[PDB]
Design a protein around this ligand. Structure first.
Ligand code: CA
Ligand code: CA
Ligand code: CA
Ligand code: CA
Ligand code: CA
Ligand code: CL
Ligand code: CL
Ligand code: CL
Lengths: 211, 204
């Protein structure tokens, strides 16, 4: 497809293109990619990850700054003319990035320092703690090893049962905003507990919170 | 539980409260709600939908502007003092509203306009049991045919305004609970009453 016909001098937009021509651009992209000619410059339109939006690239090599910028402007125009809401692909990406934020992704920033501080406070030297329990409760569910510095974490928001994790692993889970490996809930301060707040219960076969 | 002791004159903040008192506030909210006394004014602290954040309301009726604003300032302070990041509940709600956006929530504005346009095209009327709309429970003046689901073949007559209301509020299909989509909307000539089935069926 060529759009040189619709070019205009001294400005960064093209003339009123007829819809059927744009539909053919959308078809050529929907196949794979659409190669548009402007002046005698190549631009490649590919369909974006979101349905109905299109993204342009400039197949260029060693061209003049003027040509680069003008080309980019024409891509912006083509993108706006093709896309829903007259958006550029960049704007589309920003909006989609906003959409793709998840529960607690923004509110974790405020809770983080408190949470890390609580981990830091609650962490203990495992071998000094002289835990009389079976090997399985000595090993972290993330590292699959006995940690040197260990931290007790509850199985869920309201669980009376906690497990021993590697401090570094807990720090990694919190810093990556990862879900609790069992409950899949967001990890929160109240889940973290100090060595003296939990005891091994032989009949339940688990560390239980103190009464 | 009272914070008047920690009040300060001519300003919107309280004195350095001792943590054990705040813990008791957190307990009283964690139960249900905590009733705080400030001056001789009631404020109710509830835990927000997000864990770790707290929201204050002023149980008031016909009180002085001064009292309203001062009360609200004290709620702002209490909220900031209690909440993570020193945020107000409002700010929390804004952040959470940002988080709660879903795929296509910003980018789908054209599907509303397309849907409304299709309703507009498909609606039929006078104006230059199967008669009554399942939403309005009335016979509409301007009616529109909508399919019971994505692949139903059976449609019902709705009030145009009701369909506009469903689409504008992004509401689920009242029967199938699917998202309402253009293909579900059909024009008068695409459906016929079938006596044996007792329903409007799509054309063959
Ligand atoms: Ca989101
Ligand atoms: Ca050690
Ligand atoms: Ca060791
Ligand atoms: Ca050692
Ligand atoms: Ca997460
Ligand atoms: Cl849009
Ligand atoms: Cl220790
Ligand atoms: Cl998950």
């Amino acid at each position: 497809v060529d759009l040189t016909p619709y070019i205009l001098p001294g400005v960064s937009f093209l003339s009123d293109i007829p819809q059927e021509t744009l539909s053919e651009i959308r078809n050529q992209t929907i196949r794979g990619e659409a190669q548009i000619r402007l002046g005698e410059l190549m631009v490649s339109i590919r369909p974006m990850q979101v349905n109905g939006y299109f993204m342009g690239s400039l197949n260029q090599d060693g061209l003049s700054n003027d040509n680069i910028q003008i080309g980019l402007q024409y891509i912006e125009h083509i993108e706006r003319t093709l896309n829903h809401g007259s958006l550029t692909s960049r704007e589309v990406t920003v909006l989609r990035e906003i959409e793709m934020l998840e529960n607690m992704d923004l509110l974790s920033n405020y809770q983080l320092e408190e949470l890390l501080d609580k981990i830091e406070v609650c962490a203990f030297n495992v071998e000094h703690a002289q835990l009389q329990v079976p090997e399985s409760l000595r090993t972290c569910p993330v590292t699959l090893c006995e940690p040197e510095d260990g931290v007790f974490m509850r199985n869920s928001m309201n669980s009376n049962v906690c497990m021993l994790y590697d401090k570094m692993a807990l720090i990694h889970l919190v810093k990556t905003r990862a879900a609790h490996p069992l409950s899949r809930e967001s990890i929160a301060v109240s889940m973290i507990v100090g060595r003296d707040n939990a005891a091994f219960d032989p009949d339940r076969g688990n560390f239980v919170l103190k009464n």
